[PDB]
Every structure is written in C-alpha cells, then in structure tokens.
C-alpha cells in the first residue's frame, strides 16, 4: 500500500524509496513514465538486511537516466523538482491548487 518514489536522486538527492500515500500531496504536474521500467521493484526489494548496495545504486542510476531524459522535455521541470516546497505567509492550502 506504499508508493515507489524517486527524486530523481541526481536532481534531488532523494533516492528510490517508499512513501505513504497519506503523507504526500499529489500535485497536478505529471511526467511520462511509460518509458521507465519499475518491474523489479517490490516489497522484498526494500527488505531490511552506512553502505548502500551496488544493486541499489545501479537501479537508481538506470531509473534516473530515463527519468531525466523525460524530464528535460518540460522546461523548468528539473528546477521545480530540485527546489523544496514550503508554505509562505498568506498561503492557504484549503484554497491552493496543487
């Protein structure tokens, strides 16, 4: 029941990991991920067994390659993904569209 998520790591520093759907705001911006292979990723992939596995680093790089290739198409999308979100003074989340 979790969501598989990538930064991408090169853009953000956020690797492939899981998040809970209730701790996430789903914006309206979308990236075409039909060209991204996420078949091998499942619950057992993130099993608990610092040093990070070479398999995990390789999968990060391989996924981020396709993600960046598709991200470059939309202008300012890489900068948007690389920038953090915060609530400014006078920002009302009940009135904002995400």
């Amino acid at each position: 029941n979790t969501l598989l998520v990538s930064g991408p790591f090169k853009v953000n520093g956020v690797p492939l990991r899981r998040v809970n759907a209730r701790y996430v705001i789903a914006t309206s911006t979308k990236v075409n991920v039909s060209g991204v292979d996420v078949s091998k990723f499942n619950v057992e992939y993130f099993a608990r067994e610092k040093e990070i596995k070479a398999e995990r680093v390789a999968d990060q790089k391989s996924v981020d390659a396709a993600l960046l290739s598709e991200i470059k198409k939309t202008p300012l999308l890489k900068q948007y993904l690389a920038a953090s979100f915060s609530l400014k003074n006078g920002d009302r989340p009940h009135l904002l569209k995400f």
């Binding site: 701790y23 705001i25 979100f85 609530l87 009302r92 009940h94």
Partner: protein, 106 residues
C-alpha cells in the same frame, strides 16, 4: 529557502464550555486564514502538534510535543474542535499550535 514551514499556524483558543463549566477533553483551535466551516472542513482529521519547551532534557532534547487531531468544526467562523492525547494545559490559551498537512487527501 528563508521559509521552511510545512504546517498551518494555529492557536489554542479555549476549551469546550458552557457559561460556567468547561470541558478540557475538547479544545477549540483557530486555524490561520480559515473563516468559515467550509474552509475548516479541509482540515478535519489533520494532525495537530503543540510544541513546547521543558526544563529537563529527554534524550538530549528540551522540546516536547502533545499530539492531537482535528475532529469537527465549531460555530460559524471557522474554528475547529481538536482532541489531543493529553488535554492541552489551560495555560496554553492563546498559544500557537501547528496544524499538519497530513493525513493528506490531496
């Protein structure tokens, strides 16, 4: 990068009360920028943190939190009723709380 806030500012206003009797189990919370029950219904079920400082360190930290949640609206001007694990102490009337954006439903 000057701003890092991911919560909505709130205030602990009152307990649930009649003229003479107060009910500490329910707190009245004012969420900033909310002026109607329709606006306040966005925040139903959201978590609330009362963050305060204490004399003794616990695991190297002097910051403690009381957690709660928004349960329902109150009145017509956008106040909400909140339910904390431990009742907010009466001294916090007018103190600021944090209205978290989770559990998210956007």
């Amino acid at each position: 990068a000057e701003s890092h806030r991911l919560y909505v500012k709130g205030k602990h206003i009152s307990y649930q009360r009649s003229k003479s009797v107060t009910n500490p189990n329910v707190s009245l919370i004012q969420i900033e920028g909310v002026a109607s029950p329709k606006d306040a219904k966005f925040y139903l079920g959201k978590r609330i943190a009362y963050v305060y400082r204490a004399p003794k360190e616990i695991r190297g930290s002097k910051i403690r939190v009381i957690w709660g949640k928004v349960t329902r609206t109150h009145g017509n001007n956008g106040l909400v009723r909140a339910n904390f694990k431990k009742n907010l102490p009466p001294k916090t009337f007018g103190a600021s709380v944090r209205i978290m954006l989770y559990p998210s439903n956007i």
